Amino acid sequence: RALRVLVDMDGVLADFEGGFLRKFRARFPDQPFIALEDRRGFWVSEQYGRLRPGLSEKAISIWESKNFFFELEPLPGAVEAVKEMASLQNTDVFICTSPIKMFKYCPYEKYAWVEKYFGPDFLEQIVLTRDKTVVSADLLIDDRPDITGAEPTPSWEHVLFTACHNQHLQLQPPRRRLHSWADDWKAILDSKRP
Amino acid sequence: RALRVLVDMDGVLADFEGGFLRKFRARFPDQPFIALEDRRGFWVSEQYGRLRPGLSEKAISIWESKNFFFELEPLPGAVEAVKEMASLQNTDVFICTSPIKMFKYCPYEKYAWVEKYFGPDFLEQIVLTRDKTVVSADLLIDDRPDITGAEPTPSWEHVLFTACHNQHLQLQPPRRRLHSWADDWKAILDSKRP
Ligand SMILES: [Mg+2]
Numbered sequence: 399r400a401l402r403v404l405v406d407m408d409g410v411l412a413d414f415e416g417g418f419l420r421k422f423r424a425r426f427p428d429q430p431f432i433a434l435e436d437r438r439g440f441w442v443s444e445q446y447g448r449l450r451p452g453l454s455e456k457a458i459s460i461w462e463s464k465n466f467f468f469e470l471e472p473l474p475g476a477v478e479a480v481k482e483m484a485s486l487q488n489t490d491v492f493i494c495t496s497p498i499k500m501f502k503y504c505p506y507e508k509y510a511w512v513e514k515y516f517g518p519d520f521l522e523q524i525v526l527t528r529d530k531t532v533v534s535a536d537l538l539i540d541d542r543p544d545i546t547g548a549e550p551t552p553s554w555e556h557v558l559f560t561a562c563h564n565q566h567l568q569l570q571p572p573r574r575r576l577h578s579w580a581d582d583w584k585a586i587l588d589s590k591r592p
Numbered sequence: 593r594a595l596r597v598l599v600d601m602d603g604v605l606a607d608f609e610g611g612f613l614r615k616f617r618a619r620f621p622d623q624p625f626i627a628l629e630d631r632r633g634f635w636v637s638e639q640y641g642r643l644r645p646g647l648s649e650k651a652i653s654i655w656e657s658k659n660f661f662f663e664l665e666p667l668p669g670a671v672e673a674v675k676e677m678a679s680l681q682n683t684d685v686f687i688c689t690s691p692i693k694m695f696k697y698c699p700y701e702k703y704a705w706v707e708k709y710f711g712p713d714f715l716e717q718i719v720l721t722r723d724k725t726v727v728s729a730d731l732l733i734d735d736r737p738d739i740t741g742a743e744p745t746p747s748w749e750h751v752l753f754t755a756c757h758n759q760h761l762q763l764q765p766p767r768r769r770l771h772s773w774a775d776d777w778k779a780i781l782d783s784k785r786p
Pocket residue numbers: 406407408409410540541542
């Protein structure tokens with residue numbers, strides 16, 4: 399009966415791409431980098447790996463460092479939109495996020511970041527998982543173009559959240575986008591209601 | 593097509609009740625305690641709270657301490673059973689576990705514990721969530737008697753794993769139990785296959 403919406407964290411609530419570039423440039427000032435406008439493909443480390451040998455490992459070292467996830471800044475409008483979305487009648491919102499492989503800091507900092515921007519009671523809405531296809535819901539708003547896993551037919555409709563790395567992608571017709579949190583997310587939710 | 597099975601962590605893979613009692617007695621040797629045979633009800637802190645004022649907070653302080661989750665011992669047969677279950681054809685296993693409210697150590701230690709007993713590649717099968725009803729699967733093996741959340745009609749069948757706190761419970765007829773990992777878990781899985 400309640401519409402269930404899963405909202406991604408990196409690239410949707412938290413500005414992973416800008417935080418990464420800033421810290422990469424500060425730590426490795428003598429290395430070439432990729433301006434956000436020139437980002438292509440989901441995996442940051444793969445594109446850095448193509449720009450020069452050893453750069454993929456240096457890029458990885460930035461998000462594996464302590465405080466990287468905790469210090470990410472929210473995207474404009476994200477905190478306000480998700481707070482409003484969660485307060486809507488017949489609407490349950492969960493933050494569904496995938497941790498990186500090195501787990502020393504990332505899970506902990508993601509819970510701390512949600513507590514900081516949404517409060518202690520919102521911690522109950524977090525789902526950490528590498529596989530989002532096994533989480534059931536009506537909608538998944540996520541900036542990754544291809545979301546796959548153990549369930550071949552996920553129950554949610556994936557709405558692609560725009561990001562520097564996917565903004566030029568042409569999607570297969572059925573597929574929809576949410577361009578930013580300033581875009582009309584309520585209309586998307588309502589199109590899925592009974 | 594593959595059968596999907598969710599396996600709980602505390603009380604099913606990891607011996608939370610015995611680890612808790614041991615550490616509680618070592619830290620608070622002058623306080624009364626609850627022998628496992630006398631445990632009743634899911635929430636440990638509630639029963640300790642009834643045995644003497646201030647004991648609920650002392651009990652909580654044990655599982656909120658660093659290394660409590662990481663040092664839990666596996667239940668007999670659990671690691672071997674889940675490793676065999678995951679290697680079965682047409683069978684996907686996920687560890688679905690709910691962290692406690694204080695998140696400084698628990699999520700991190702649960703990933704570290706899975707890495708220790710199942711290896712780095714199994715970290716991909718972990719789902720951390722307070723709400724297991726939004727995870728879809730064919731079966732959920734979990735020692736908690738009443739598992740509820742945002743989805744009123746979960747897709748999985750909940751098989752109750754026996755624990756000191758639920759061993760005397762009479763379940764409503766349809767409901768099934770797995771008595772220990774020595775019990776016949778393969779027969780349970782097979783009863784759900786096509
Ligand atoms: Mg993302």
